[PDB]
Amino acid sequence: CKGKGAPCRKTMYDCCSGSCGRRGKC
Secondary structure, three states: OEOOOOEOOOOOOOEOOOOOOOOOEO
């Protein structure tokens, strides 16, 4: 998982935060 503000994809909530951004950051 990608930590807060890390280059994720909310498409599948790729973050450790559990809620990625539409901007592509966690």
